[PDB]
Amino acid sequence: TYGNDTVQYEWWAGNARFADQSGLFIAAHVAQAALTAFWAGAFTLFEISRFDPTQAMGDQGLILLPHLATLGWGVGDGGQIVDTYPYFVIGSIHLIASAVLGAGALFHTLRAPADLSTLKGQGKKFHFTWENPQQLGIILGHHLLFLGAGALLLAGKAMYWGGLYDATTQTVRLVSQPTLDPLVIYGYQTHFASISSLEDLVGGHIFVGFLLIGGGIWHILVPPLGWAKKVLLFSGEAILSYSLGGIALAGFVAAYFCAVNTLAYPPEFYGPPLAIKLGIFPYFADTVELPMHAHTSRAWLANAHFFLAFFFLQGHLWHALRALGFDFKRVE
Amino acid sequence: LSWSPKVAGVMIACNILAIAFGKLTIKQQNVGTPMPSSNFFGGFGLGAVLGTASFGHILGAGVILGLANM
Amino acid sequence: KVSVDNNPVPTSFEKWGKPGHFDRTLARGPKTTTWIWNLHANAHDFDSQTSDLEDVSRKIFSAHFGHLAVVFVWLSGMYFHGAKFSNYEGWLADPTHIKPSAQVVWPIVGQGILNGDVGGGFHGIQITSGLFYLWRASGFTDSYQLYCTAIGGLVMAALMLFAGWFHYHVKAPKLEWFQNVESMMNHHLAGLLGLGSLGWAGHQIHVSMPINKLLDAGVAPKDIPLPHEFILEPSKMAELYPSFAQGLTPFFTLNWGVYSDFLTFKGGLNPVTGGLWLSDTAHHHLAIAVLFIIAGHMYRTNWGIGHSMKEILEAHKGPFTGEGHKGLYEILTTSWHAQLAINLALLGSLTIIVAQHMYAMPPYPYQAIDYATQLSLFTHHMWIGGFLIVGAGAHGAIFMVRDYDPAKNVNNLLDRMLRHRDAIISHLNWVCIFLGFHSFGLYIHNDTMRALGRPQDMFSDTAIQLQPIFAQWVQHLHTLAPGATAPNALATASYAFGGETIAVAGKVAMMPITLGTADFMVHHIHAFTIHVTALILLKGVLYARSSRLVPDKANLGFRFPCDGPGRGGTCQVSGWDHVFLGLFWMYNSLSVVIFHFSWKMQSDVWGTVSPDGSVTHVTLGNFAQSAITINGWLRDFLWAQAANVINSYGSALSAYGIMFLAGHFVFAFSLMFLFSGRGYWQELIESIVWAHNKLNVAPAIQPRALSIIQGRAVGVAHYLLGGIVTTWAFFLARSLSIG
Amino acid sequence: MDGLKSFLSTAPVMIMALLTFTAGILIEFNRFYPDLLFH
Ligand code: CLA
Ligand code: CLA
Ligand code: CLA
Ligand SMILES: CC1=C(C/C=C(\C)CCC[C@H](C)CCC[C@H](C)CCCC(C)C)C(=O)c2ccccc2C1=O
Numbered sequence A: 001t002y003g004n005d006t007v008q009y010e011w012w013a014g015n016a017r018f019a020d021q022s023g024l025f026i027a028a029h030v031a032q033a034a035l036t037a038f039w040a041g042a043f044t045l046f047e048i049s050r051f052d053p054t055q056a057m058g059d060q061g062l063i064l065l066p067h068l069a070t071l072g073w074g075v076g077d078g079g080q081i082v083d084t085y086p087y088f089v090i091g092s093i094h095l096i097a098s099a100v101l102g103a104g105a106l107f108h109t110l111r112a113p114a115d116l117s118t119l120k121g122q123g124k125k126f127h128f129t130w131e132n133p134q135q136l137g138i139i140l141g142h143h144l145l146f147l148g149a150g151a152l153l154l155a156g157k158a159m160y161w162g163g164l165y166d167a168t169t170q171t172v173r174l175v176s177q178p179t180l181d182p183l184v185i186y187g188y189q190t191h192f193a194s195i196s197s198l199e200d201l202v203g204g205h206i207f208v209g210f211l212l213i214g215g216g217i218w219h220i221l222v223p224p225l226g227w228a229k230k231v232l233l234f235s236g237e238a239i240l241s242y243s244l245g246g247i248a249l250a251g252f253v254a255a256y257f258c259a260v261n262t263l264a265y266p267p268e269f270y271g272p273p274l275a276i277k278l279g280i281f282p283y284f285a286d287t288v289e290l291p292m293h294a295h296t297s298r299a300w301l302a303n304a305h306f307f308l309a310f311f312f313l314q315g316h317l318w319h320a321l322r323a324l325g326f327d328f329k330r331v332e
Numbered sequence B: 001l002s003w004s005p006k007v008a009g010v011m012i013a014c015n016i017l018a019i020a021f022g023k024l025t026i027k028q029q030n031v032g033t034p035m036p037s038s039n040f041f042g043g044f045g046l047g048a049v050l051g052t053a054s055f056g057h058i059l060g061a062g063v064i065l066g067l068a069n070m
Numbered sequence C: 001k002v003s004v005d006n007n008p009v010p011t012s013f014e015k016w017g018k019p020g021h022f023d024r025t026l027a028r029g030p031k032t033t034t035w036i037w038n039l040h041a042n043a044h045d046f047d048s049q050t051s052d053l054e055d056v057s058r059k060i061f062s063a064h065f066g067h068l069a070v071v072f073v074w075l076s077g078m079y080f081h082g083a084k085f086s087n088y089e090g091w092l093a094d095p096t097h098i099k100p101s102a103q104v105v106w107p108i109v110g111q112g113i114l115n116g117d118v119g120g121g122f123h124g125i126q127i128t129s130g131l132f133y134l135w136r137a138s139g140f141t142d143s144y145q146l147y148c149t150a151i152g153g154l155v156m157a158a159l160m161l162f163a164g165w166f167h168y169h170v171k172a173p174k175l176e177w178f179q180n181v182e183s184m185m186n187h188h189l190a191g192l193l194g195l196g197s198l199g200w201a202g203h204q205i206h207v208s209m210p211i212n213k214l215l216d217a218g219v220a221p222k223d224i225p226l227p228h229e230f231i232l233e234p235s236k237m238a239e240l241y242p243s244f245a246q247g248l249t250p251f252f253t254l255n256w257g258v259y260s261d262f263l264t265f266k267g268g269l270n271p272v273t274g275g276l277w278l279s280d281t282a283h284h285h286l287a288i289a290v291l292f293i294i295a296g297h298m299y300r301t302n303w304g305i306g307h308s309m310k311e312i313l314e315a316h317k318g319p320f321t322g323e324g325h326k327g328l329y330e331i332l333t334t335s336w337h338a339q340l341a342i343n344l345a346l347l348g349s350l351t352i353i354v355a356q357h358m359y360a361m362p363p364y365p366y367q368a369i370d371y372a373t374q375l376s377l378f379t380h381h382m383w384i385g386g387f388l389i390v391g392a393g394a395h396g397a398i399f400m401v402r403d404y405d406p407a408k409n410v411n412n413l414l415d416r417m418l419r420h421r422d423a424i425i426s427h428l429n430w431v432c433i434f435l436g437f438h439s440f441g442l443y444i445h446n447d448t449m450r451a452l453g454r455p456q457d458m459f460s461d462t463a464i465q466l467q468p469i470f471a472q473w474v475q476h477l478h479t480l481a482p483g484a485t486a487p488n489a490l491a492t493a494s495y496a497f498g499g500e501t502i503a504v505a506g507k508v509a510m511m512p513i514t515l516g517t518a519d520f521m522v523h524h525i526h527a528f529t530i531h532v533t534a535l536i537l538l539k540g541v542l543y544a545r546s547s548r549l550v551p552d553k554a555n556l557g558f559r560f561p562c563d564g565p566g567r568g569g570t571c572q573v574s575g576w577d578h579v580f581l582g583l584f585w586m587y588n589s590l591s592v593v594i595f596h597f598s599w600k601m602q603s604d605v606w607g608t609v610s611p612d613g614s615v616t617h618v619t620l621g622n623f624a625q626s627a628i629t630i631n632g633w634l635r636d637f638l639w640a641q642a643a644n645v646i647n648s649y650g651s652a653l654s655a656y657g658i659m660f661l662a663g664h665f666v667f668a669f670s671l672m673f674l675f676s677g678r679g680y681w682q683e684l685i686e687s688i689v690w691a692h693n694k695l696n697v698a699p700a701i702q703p704r705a706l707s708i709i710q711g712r713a714v715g716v717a718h719y720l721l722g723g724i725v726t727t728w729a730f731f732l733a734r735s736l737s738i739g
Numbered sequence D: 001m002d003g004l005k006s007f008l009s010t011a012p013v014m015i016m017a018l019l020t021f022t023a024g025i026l027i028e029f030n031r032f033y034p035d036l037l038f039h
């Protein structure tokens, strides 16, 4: 991002060419979202064929089917699955959503131009750059409602469209009328590792979606005034580092949330809650041990979300160093 | 015989002995695919450092399996 | 570093109707009938058609793809005949009793009697190639897998044909792509040999080990799980071996000692099925894969590390050897004949190694029990090896005549070896004559001492005994090897050195082969004939440039009949005629070698077994005191064992009798071409042209006799064909009569 | 294919087609009427 205007990028660094073009920028980022939707649908259909109803869910290595059994899609009483097909409708939709998102991925790099400033209609108001703060606030502002939308879609699922599975009573709990106070949310910062409460899970999700919808209307209507510009930067790898350090924090707290929690990650499907060990690296080792050399899904999810978020933290260090005034500096 | 700091210690020690060997006696070292820097060891390059790390692993399996039964 | 030219040769069918276009003197017109023979004598002489080193190399590459299509359609025919017209599932139901047969004969003229009762009601001709035991070693269960393998082989046959057309007429590589010999060597080491060995190690781990394990347990056909079901359910593989529950994770942490239950170093033979252990061969192919891919990174291509072979050849120079190998890297990358001579030499010795290893360490299940399979596989690989070694002696001489430039290699090893050709050949023929007297005159001496009624003056064991002490000491070391010099090995390398008698199904797989004085004399016979064939071929290589008789031999060519009747006579002086003599001497050498093999193994090794431990052989131990006489080789071997070829009419072994007499016919027919010369036949053919001109039927193609080189070539071809067909019919009919 | 008609009419392919036709009619006559030592 530094030096001259155009620097020769080799094929091992070729994705630093469309960063400023803003037309192919949408094409790669929804091709990526098509790949996650491809992994959402195909790898929950890959695990239908490798599903054993008699054997327990933890030792088999089932990842995504415990994620749908948490939401009470097709789980029965006692901790078993009574019907496979509700796990098949959601994977079918995610594969079709992977097709249409993959369809528009080639739309924004074959027929749509390399930028969005050549357009004249509604598409002329979609071009952006790494300089204008009011142009990056309208992109960020419309994102904050969709993150707040998943909380209200969680509320309508939990209140009127299905229950949740827990370990305190071990059944599908179609609950309603959650807690109406915000003072205990300040107190849950010290024992979030064991929530031990089902009505506050959906009760905190509505109490955080009201905050996420507050940041949506705020970020659209007003631009950055300048109190953020004097302390921060506005560049290509700059705004990359604000996010890539932030999503690294999300993978950090989710790798910790997998190994110790019981309610949101039920132990009847993921396996028993792990213990934090540190040898050379901090790895969430299993408490009980398997007869073969296999590990449970809680051991796989918590260890992979920590190893890969640690590299995503140190990759945030790679971009924050280059977004600031620092070269490679191979001196002495 | 399993994962331990003892087997990793003798592996790393004979590996860096093999890096010093490749830095001492390889005839042409630098002219391959270029390394990003010279911070690791010498001025090797990508193919050269892959070669001396692979010889570190060959020497590693040598003394480890020569001492796991002795 | 890929250099490809695009569309060098247009694809057209119009050149197919003009035969002889590749050479300048053949495309003019067939004025004479010898042009026809020249059309086949120069059809693959690609160095005489093009002289630019780039057109010939791509012609060779596409010819390799065409020959690969021929091998793939041959292998497809083997798997298709094993699928449709065989009894592979019937033989797999009962391997000890019934006999394999993979060829059914159409009854037309009375040849339905060739479909003998091979066991189980199935009729056909009993095969001796023994690829059924190859299929049981690989893990074939039903005929549908053989049928789909034949279909996939025909697919790759058409794929190799398309690759040949693509690499000659569409995208043909340049000369620098062919001369990248270090990239070719390390790709062939790692990606072809080592990667193929790793593939077969994986197949032997996953398919060949569990199927043969439960087949040795006694599971009937149509009850074996399918080979993919062991991968689809690893519990069925983990119940057979305890180490498969450990997963891949001990392999990467160098915890290989827990893999010891299924990668064993047992050695010897399997006592249940009479072959090598499949866990032993799986560990074996894995070790060969690791060593080859390690050796597959030795030569530098693009990344600096690696040995370019030029300074390897520069560095080896001593006091005796002058400038050393200075120039050989420029020789072997600019001349295909020197590469062909080295590769034919080492492939011939490899094939002889294959024969000498596939009889004392039988690698296939129920292979050592079937004596016909063992004898046929031995002698056929012996013959292929000896043929390729004679071809090495040929292409060395062709390199000397047409690919040897003396200005480039001065005072190197090639020039120094050509400078003392007399000091090599005059000692080689001395050791030929010394071995000849001391391996054949021993046989004449005790033939005469037996004929004169004095057996105490022979060279027998009770007589003056020539005990082969060196190989007996080597057998003692191989018997004492497991526990002292191979402590992790349970059994020996083989049971032919020393050990117990392996009995499987009432027959003997392998017992220790003691070496008396008869083995001493016949091994010196083998060393003698090896030395004479290595004399004729070596003095065809060295004396191909020039000599003191005729010093103009390089300008006359490699393949010329003579220089003339002068200097006393110079017929058969070329480098070609030394190959013509070496072919007969390879025939004589390998005939005595396979005769020694067949007689020693059916007198001291094979035979039935008895439950009290005593072994009775097929010929009751004749090799001890009756293999030392020429009359003993004639009476007790060539007369007594040929009775199974003689008295087998009206039976299944009836075609071998009319191949026995057929091989005698082609031998006797070869003598007409060998003994006579051309000018008699020219003087006779011109009289037949007179008798045709009397009736106005004389052809406008001028009919005349064969060339002198052509007459010697058809003589040696019919001689080798007739002798090998006679030995093939005798060995097959004898060893199918004895079981 | 102005060259394929010439290649299929060379001496070896024509003598092999003629010997295949001759062996074919000989084998067919020996199947439908076998073992004829005389007339
Ligand atoms: C979503 C986050 C994100 C984004 C958008 C980018 C974007 C970019 N990075 Mg990057 N990076 C990230 C995270 C990210 N990075 C992290 C987390 C790390 C730490 C490991 C790095 C380390 C890194 C380096 C060291 C470099 C870049 C560079 C670049 C730029 C060129 C693209 C490139 O690498 O070449 C195109 C992409 C590739 C060649 C892919 C590389 C894949 C290699 C060959 C295999 C690696 C293992 C692979 C992931 C398989 C493992 C599977 C696993 C599950 C086990 C581009 C702007 C380069 C740059 O700016 O040039 C100066 C550069 O040199 N990045
Ligand atoms: C890798 C193997 C290989 C390769 C590529 C070559 C390649 C070559 N050889 Mg050669 N050769 C080889 C092995 C090989 N050889 C071996 C092993 C021997 C020892 C026997 C020889 C002996 C030999 C001689 C003696 C001569 C050559 C010559 C040649 C060159 C021209 C070929 C030619 O005109 O024949 C075209 C093809 C034929 C004439 C067909 C031969 C048909 C044979 C004789 C009959 C086959 C019998 C059959 C198996 C039985 C069934 C038939 C019937 C009963 C139904 C060519 C470069 C010649 C040369 O360079 O002269 C300048 C030459 O004079 N070679
Ligand atoms: C059976 C017939 C026969 C015999 C005996 C020989 C014998 C020999 N050939 Mg030979 N050869 C033959 C057929 C035969 N060939 C055929 C058919 C071909 C055609 C391809 C060749 C092609 C051929 C070549 C191309 C070469 C030979 C060579 C040799 C000699 C090798 C030296 C040796 O063995 O020690 C000598 C062994 C004997 C003489 C046989 C032993 C007989 C006894 C022990 C001797 C008699 C005892 C005593 C003298 C009797 C005294 C009685 C008194 C009244 C005189 C040897 C003389 C090579 C040669 O001469 O150089 C070394 C050579 O280069 N041969
Ligand atoms: C008989 C003889 C001839 C004469 C050779 C001739 C006449 C060749 C005979 C060829 C005839 C035409 C038979 C055809 C050959 C094959 C049978 C062709 C196969 C055809 C079938 C596939 C149909 C020589 O020229 C000669 C030269 C030097 C030394 C010895 C001799 C020698 O002995």
Ligand code: SF4
Pocket (backbone or CB within 6 Å): C561, C562, C563, C564, C565, C566, C569, C570, C571, C572, C677, C708
């Ligand atoms: S006999 Fe024949 S080969 Fe011998 S010299 Fe005379 S012409 Fe030449």
